[PDB]
Amino acid sequence: QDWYREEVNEKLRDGTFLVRDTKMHGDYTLTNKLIKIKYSSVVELINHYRNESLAQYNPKLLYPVNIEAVGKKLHEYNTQFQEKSREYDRLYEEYTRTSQEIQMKRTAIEAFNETIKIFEEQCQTQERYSKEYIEKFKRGNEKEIQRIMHNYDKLKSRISEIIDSRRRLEEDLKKQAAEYREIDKRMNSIKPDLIQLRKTRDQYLMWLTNEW
């Protein structure tokens, strides 16, 4: 008794091997690739393939991976892990919605730009047809042109606002893009320790073999 499916694959998660147990089917199994198993023994055959490779049989097995005083440490490692998982679950939210919000800005910036161009074209459009009517007739005069001046004066100081408005958006894109990086930065720090906090919690529960 004393290396010897679902919980086998979870122990192959991330050379590594182990041996498994219908009896009218086979007997033992070497798990990732599965090999069906004189066998003169179960411990005989495996020691031979630890040093050596599996090429010659078929066109290595390199990695054979306080009764009251470990019990509460199952609650402790779980309660940071489950705190740590929440932190990972929060940030992956923030990361994605910040990615979303970002591109809504990018699309708005494009919309702004197309808005602006129609207006640029509009102040361009009035010059062609207004400065026809400044030079025809002449003696309308100021009751005509100083109202055609008023219209135009609005037309550009509006465009001013629209470009102001676009800039003010563009700056926020940067600050958002900054925060986006920062989130990812910390995501990648939390991740590897989350795995180690998780991996020891498996080992701590596996040695023992639930208020915790």
Partner 1 sequence: SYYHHHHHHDYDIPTYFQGASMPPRPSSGELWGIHLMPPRILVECLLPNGMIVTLECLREATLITIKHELFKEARKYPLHQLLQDESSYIFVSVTQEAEREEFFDETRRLCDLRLFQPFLKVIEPVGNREEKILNREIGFAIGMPVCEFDMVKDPEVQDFRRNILNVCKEAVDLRDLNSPHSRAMYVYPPNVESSPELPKHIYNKLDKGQIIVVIWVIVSPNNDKQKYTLKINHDCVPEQVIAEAIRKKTRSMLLSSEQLKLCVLEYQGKYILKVCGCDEYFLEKYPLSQYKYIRSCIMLGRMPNLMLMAKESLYSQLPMDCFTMPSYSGETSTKSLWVINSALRIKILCATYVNVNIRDIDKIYVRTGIYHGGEPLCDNVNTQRVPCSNPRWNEWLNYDIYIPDLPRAARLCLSICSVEEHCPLAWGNINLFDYTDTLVSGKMALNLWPVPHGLEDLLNPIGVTGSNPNKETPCLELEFDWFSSVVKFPDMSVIEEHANWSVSREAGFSYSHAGLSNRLARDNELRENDKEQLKAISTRDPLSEITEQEKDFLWSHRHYCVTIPEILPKLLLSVKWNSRDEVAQMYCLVKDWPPIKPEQAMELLDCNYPDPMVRGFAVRCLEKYLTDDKLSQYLIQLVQVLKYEQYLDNLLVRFLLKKALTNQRIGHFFFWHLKSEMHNKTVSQRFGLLLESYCRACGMYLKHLNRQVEAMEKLINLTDILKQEKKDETQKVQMKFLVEQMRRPDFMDALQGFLSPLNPAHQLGNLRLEECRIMSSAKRPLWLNWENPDIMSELLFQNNEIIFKNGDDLRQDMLTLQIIRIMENIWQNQGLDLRMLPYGCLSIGDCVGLIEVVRNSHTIMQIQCKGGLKGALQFNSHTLHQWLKDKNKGEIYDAAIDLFTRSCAGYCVATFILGIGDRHNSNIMVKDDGQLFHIDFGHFLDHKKKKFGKRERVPFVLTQDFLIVISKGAQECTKTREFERFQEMCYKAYLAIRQHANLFINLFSMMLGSGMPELQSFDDIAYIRKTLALDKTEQEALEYFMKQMNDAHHGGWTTKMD
In the region spanning residues 132 to 161, those forming contacts with partner 1, defined by CB under 8 A, are 133, 144, 147-148, 151, 154-155, 158
Q: Can you tell me which of 67, 142, 210, 211 binds partner 1, judged by CB under 8 A?
A: 210
Q: How many CB atoms lie within 10 A of CB 19?
A: 19
**Cβ closest to partner 1, residue 55 vs residue 69:** 55
Q: Kindly state the number of chain residues that form the binding site for partner 1, as judged by CB under 8 A.
A: 72
**Cβ closest to partner 1, residue 50 vs residue 186:** 186
CB of 127 to partner 1, least distance (A): 7
Work out whether 103 is an interface residue with partner 1 (CB under 8 A).
yes
* Residue 17: Cβ-neighbour burial (10 angstroms; 0-12, 13-18, 19+): buried
Q: Can you tell me which of 4, 39, 92, 137 binds partner 1, judged by CB under 8 A?
A: 92
| Sheet containing strand 29-30, strands side by side | 19-20, 29-30, 35-36
**C-alpha to C-alpha distances, 115 to 138, 166, 168, nearest whole angstrom:** 34, 10, 15
Work out whether 108 is an interface residue with partner 1 (CB under 8 A).
yes
Residue at token pair 């958002």? 176
Residues 6 or more apart whose Cβ sits within 8 Å of residue 200:
77
Residue at token pair 């998780």? 198
Give residues 57-76 in contact with partner 1 (rule: CB under 8 A).
57-59
Q: Can you tell me which of 119, 163, 179, 204 binds partner 1, judged by CB under 8 A?
A: 119
Q: Can you tell me which of 1, 2, 15, 36 binds partner 1, judged by CB under 8 A?
A: 36
Distance CA 24, CA 26 (A): 6
Q: Can you tell me which of 93, 137, 167, 200 binds partner 1, judged by CB under 8 A?
A: 93
**C-alpha to C-alpha distances, 159 to 13, 123, 144, 151, nearest whole angstrom:** 60, 9, 24, 13
Work out whether 47 is an interface residue with partner 1 (CB under 8 A).
no
Q: Can you tell me which of 64, 126, 163, 204 binds partner 1, judged by CB under 8 A?
A: 126
CB of 45 to partner 1, least distance (A): 14
Work out whether 34 is an interface residue with partner 1 (CB under 8 A).
yes
Distance CA 15, CA 61 (A): 5
